[PDB]
């Protein structure tokens, strides 16, 4: 079932990979943590409603590029937090509706204790999300790939 993003450019039914540009907080002191609100960014909807109850999962969520050495925490799926990068398949959620339901995922990142200057570069790669599609009619499993880029510079204030 086809998804979308804030830019409106995403992948069609069956799978694929896309790029999603998100805006972050320029400064977050160690402690107070910035919510990567993908919930306002990514959206998806059951293209085939009624008799086929859609099942959508976050199989793989990995953090590399900038975040692997920078702002990096857990991942909140429908309230339930899980360690990030995703070491296991998350508990399932369902959509089964003709409405671009918000992706109930937020990246509760956390700056490292050894953070320095501009830890996240504008345009650097922060996180990647893999989406699992299962339904109630066939054994078709499709992966949907999102590549999050922060178009902005995140630097934690640093003192001594």
């Amino acid at each position, epitope marked *: 079932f086809a998804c979308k993003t804030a830019n409106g450019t995403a992948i069609p039914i069956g799978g694929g990979s896309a790029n999603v540009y998100v805006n972050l907080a320029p400064a977050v002191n160690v402690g107070q943590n910035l919510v990567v609100d993908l919930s306002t960014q990514i959206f998806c909807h059951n293209d085939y409603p009624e008799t086929i109850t859609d099942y959508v999962t976050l199989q793989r969520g990995a953090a590399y590029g900038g975040v692997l050495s920078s702002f990096s925490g857990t991942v909140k799926y429908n309230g339930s937090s899980y360690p990030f990068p995703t070491t296991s398949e998350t508990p399932r959620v369902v959509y089964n509706s003709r409405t671009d339901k918000p992706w109930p995922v937020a990246l509760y990142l956390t700056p490292v204790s050894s953070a320095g200057g501009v830890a996240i570069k504008a345009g650097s790669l922060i996180a990647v999300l893999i989406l699992r599609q299962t339904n109630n009619y066939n054994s078709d499993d499709f992966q949907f790939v999102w590549n999050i880029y922060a178009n902005n*510079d995140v630097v934690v*204030p640093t003192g001594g």
Partner: antibody
Amino acid sequence: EVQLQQPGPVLVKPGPSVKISCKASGFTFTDYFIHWVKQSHGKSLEWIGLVSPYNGGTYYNQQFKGKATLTVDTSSSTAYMDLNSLTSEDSAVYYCTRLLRGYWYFDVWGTGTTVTVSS
Amino acid sequence: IVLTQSPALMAASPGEKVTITCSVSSSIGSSNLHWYQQKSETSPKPWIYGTSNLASGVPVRFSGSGSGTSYSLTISSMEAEDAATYYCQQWSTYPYTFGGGTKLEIKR
């Protein structure tokens, strides 16, 4: 109401510094980042740096990487801009400003000092 | 070159639409450059927080619009008052770089 204050004319010989203040009140402070801006007469207002009254953590850009010692006293909610080195050329108006946590931008600027270098 | 602006001075008769352009070295991140005014010997008052985003306490005639590589500001109507020098600040990379700015006078 919910604003910020700072001292007046701080005319001085080139010396070590001016070490001016930036007094804040009204809003729930020591929870919002604050930055600083230098305006040298009718020139660019090129931003200097930023200090965090939650933790200080202050850092500045490579241009004014030599004359900035921004800190804050939390109890009175008063930042301090201290020039590590003398200006002796940069007779510029210095502005305290703060950064809102929503749409991130500089808002509620300080009144501003007037730094003058003559002997 | 991380930011630049042109020209150094507009002008505006009352009731005249004014446009100012701020061009940047590379396409930035879309919708995050801020526009401030500074009157002479006065504290700067922010007007724009990213594209098409009025700041805290702006009129509606004042506005903005643009794209990811060259942004701009539009003041639809003029009543003097706002005669100040306006600067584009990029919330893209560190060091943040205020532009050259345009000392905007009033045209007669």
